Design a protein around this ligand. Sequence first.
Ligand SMILES: Cc1noc(C)c1-c1ccc2nc(-c3cnn(CC(C)(C)O)c3)nc(N3CCOC[C@@H]3c3ccccc3)c2c1
Length: 128
Amino acid sequence: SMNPPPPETSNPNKPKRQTNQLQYLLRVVLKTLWKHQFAWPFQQPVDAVKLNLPDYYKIIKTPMDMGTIKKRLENNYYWNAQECIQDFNTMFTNCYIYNKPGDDIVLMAEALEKLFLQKINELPTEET
Ligand SMILES: Cc1noc(C)c1-c1ccc2nc(-c3cnn(CC(C)(C)O)c3)nc(N3CCOC[C@@H]3c3ccccc3)c2c1
C-alpha cells in the first residue's frame, strides 16, 4: 500500500498573515508541545504503510500532525489562529478515533492535549 500525499504546508494562491496569536502558537504553544516526552509520534504524518496499520487512511480522511502545523506556522500559511487550533484538534480527534481508549498512544495524545489547552488559555485575547 501507499500513504497519501501529506497535507500542504504552502499554497501560492492562499493569502497569508502573521497575527499576535499565530506567533504565540508557534513561539509558545508548539514549542512546549514539540519538546514534550510524548511528542515524537505526532512530529510527522502517520506512516501507515511502515507501521502496518489496518485501514488507517480509510478511516482518517483529514490527517494532521505537528510537523505539518509547524511548517505551516513557519511559512505563514494560516490567515487565522482558529485555522491552526482546528488543525491541532483534528490531530487529537484522529488519534481518539483510530485507537482504543486508554491505549498508550491515546494516553500520550491526552497529555499533549491537556498541555495544549493550558497554553491556549494564555493566548492574547484579541487577534491583531
Ligand atoms: C496510529 C496513530 N494514530 O495517531 C498516531 C499519532 C499514531 C501513531 C503515529 C506514530 C507511531 N509510531 C510508532 C513507532 C515508530 N517506531 N516505533 C519504535 C519501534 C521499535 C519500531 O516499535 C514505534 N508506533 C505507533 N503506534 C502504532 C500503533 O500501535 C502502538 C504504536 C506505539 C505507540 C506508542 C509507542 C510505541 C508504539 C505510532 C502511532
